Design a protein around this ligand. Structure first.
Ligand SMILES: [Fe+3]
Ligand SMILES: [Zn+2]
Lengths: 172, 172, 172, 172, 172, 172
């Protein structure tokens, strides 16, 4: 056992590794979205910038989980970062909806992680999750819901000016 | 259900609405205290300023609860803000004691809210409450206890100079 | 009678208390509108900011009325702040129209207050009203009329881009 | 009962007093380590500075705990601060290992305190512990583990240049 | 013997260790006073700040004695820091009187230390004591006498405003 | 065919996608190395920082390849980022050797990419590779060779002070 490990259940370590993989996958999905919006035939620069920022934020969340794992004496066991479920995201609105679904799934994973840490009576793990990931997930999910709502009202994707003007105003 | 709603129990939403109403009522009570101390026949400008600041802080707490409600996909259902239980607060000491009682009741409501969020396994709600309201309630209750203790020792309300000097020194 | 009171009719005192309640109610209604526009399924951040500013301005108007009441030796008697007539304001255009109606009603109340103060020959009360509330009410009513006109011409709420672009340009 | 006390179990008060004593004892032990490394025949100035900083941080932790106890209406009951288990810490590596053991024991005490506060449904106490002591304990334990690991790899204490160079580089 | 030790009698080393313990005990007593004055039911913030400053100054005096012990080649042998004689100090005036008694006892200990260092013909120890502790003790004892005199004249503790106004003016 | 695509062979598109995957894998491997060196039982902060910087640089290289693919009208097709071949890198010297091998393999892939772009007569692709990846690969491979040489000469890993001093001086 690690010299620093204390009140850090093994299955909490495994859940943290799984959450690290999930955050890396979310970063990869956001990178895919950014790439799709950097396409010449999509050409939504602010959508691409927003999703690239989300990808970097997800990578930072993963790195923070790795730092937490090392802090608690757990060992990081990296897995394959699965490819995003598709390459063509088909619209700014569809990409925002997929990002909302991804952040809701990541929030569900973090909620299960917090539940596990509570069951194992790991107050530091619970505090770390609720301080650095749960509030961030709620804020990101609310922002994505706002984006999806605005795009839907604007008439996206059918209304071609909708996505362009959302790119300029909301994301620019 | 709201597109952003996740792990947000209906009764947690109802408790948040009730807490919003309670914070608005506390703001109204503090406004009443400030108005009472702005009276010509009371004329405690720093008591009035202190209670006006408390009223604005309570309004900000309510607004933050509304922001949380919207963040979690819950719907804000505002109720009548009941009038404060009295218009004449009868002294700086009595007003401070009533403010202490009000903050204790608001803290009890927040504690019940945290208990409900814990029973419903809403870690984000628990973290939000404990981060933005429980520490603030403890600090405010301690400050009000200090104010009441100092006013009682100084001889308020019978010692008419006690309230004036507390207004100038502690609240000024 | 208050030592500072002179040429302040009791019915003027009651009218000022009623106006304080009405301004607090207007603040509450504007807060409700801001909450509605902070919803994930509405997501009009500048509408929410505008109505929150209106709510804070109405609260400041009530605070100034209470300061006036204390200045004149009258006694502030706070009443229940009634719940806003609805929680779902159903559109930016509808919210602006309801705000216009609310400000017109508040202006009518202030006009009746000025008429009363003129009847009781209270020149200071009349000057206070016309200096701090009548001009503000006219300006706010004109601004709300402009907002409603622009939203109606834009095609709101049927034109989904109308409310979004009004949010960005006029309110942003 | 203190006028500010609310949802503060007496046994939580006793546990906080015990944690006060434990943090003061940790401060005393760190002071002893700093003194040992300020010895002419040890002469590790950065080890002494590091352990003096740890002692002052432990004293600040105890001060914050007593501020919390007063904030919650509990009564601080100070006990004898037991002398450190020894005066000669016999090496930088041994002192770092003893500091790691001390911080692990303090973290275990804080974990038991958080468990008790959770059992007594004291969300403010739990939040205070996790916000100000659990994260700090994890960080300090990780830092001490890093220091011990680096000293062991360097060959300390047998390799006499190991402790000196760790003093200069890591602690300097 | 320590390589640096020179003209440093063994009993001078023991007296320095005893004085280190006494200064740590004085720091602990001042910490207890500060905690008592941070209580909600006495709530004298400037009394608490003054006694916390005294506690930190006593800790610094102890640290300087440890530095002197190491400088002279003596070995620091820490003992249990006895708990303060009581937790409830019962008043600002009583706390100031107890602090005066504590500083006079510490001054007596330092005077005996200087007497011993003179008997052992340790001019450096005598100079260190008279330069860093005797003048400080005389100044602190005079300040505490002034505080006690002012509180007694003001009518403390019976005069409730006495302690509050001394807290504000002298200690604030 | 993309409206912007010109002189961009399908083989070049596929090779760019493969190089994107390889750069992402290199970033993942560097992240694994950084995490390994952030372990309590490794505790080489500058090794961890160096490998984290390498991981971020590899991610930036991948992002630049994605930008190039979109610029040329090719379509980014992301694949699974395979887990690094090991989790425990077992040494600073071993990690540097593995990084050298990884950068040599990435440089070989880039060289094959340049060979393909030359065979397909894609001068812009060749220029992009040789301007942004070949010089960087040569510089990184030389730096890693220098690091490995210095660690080997220092006696790493057997000389436990070797890795620590390389961490402080070369990487710090
Ligand atoms: Fe060196
Ligand atoms: Zn002293």
């Amino acid at each position: 056992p690690s010299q620093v490990r204390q009140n850090y259940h093994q299955d909490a370590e495994a859940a943290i590794n799984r959450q690290i993989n999930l955050e890396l996958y979310a970063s990869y999905v956001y990178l895919s979205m950014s790439c799709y919006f950097d396409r010449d035939d999509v050409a939504l620069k602010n959508f691409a910038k927003y999703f690239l920022h989300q990808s970097h934020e997800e990578r930072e969340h993963a790195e923070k989980l790795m730092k937490l794992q090392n802090q608690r004496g757990g060992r990081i066991f990296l897995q394959d970062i699965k490819k995003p479920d598709r390459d063509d995201w088909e619209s700014g609105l569809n990409a925002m909806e997929c990002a909302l679904h991804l952040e809701k799934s990541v929030n569900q994973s973090l909620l299960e992680l917090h539940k596990l840490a509570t069951d194992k009576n790991d107050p530091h793990l619970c505090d770390f999750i609720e301080t650095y990931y749960l509030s961030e997930q709620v804020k990101s999910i609310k922002e994505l819901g706002d984006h999806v709502t605005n795009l839907r009202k604007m008439g996206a994707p059918e209304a071609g000016m909708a996505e362009y003007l959302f790119d300029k105003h909301t994301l620019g």
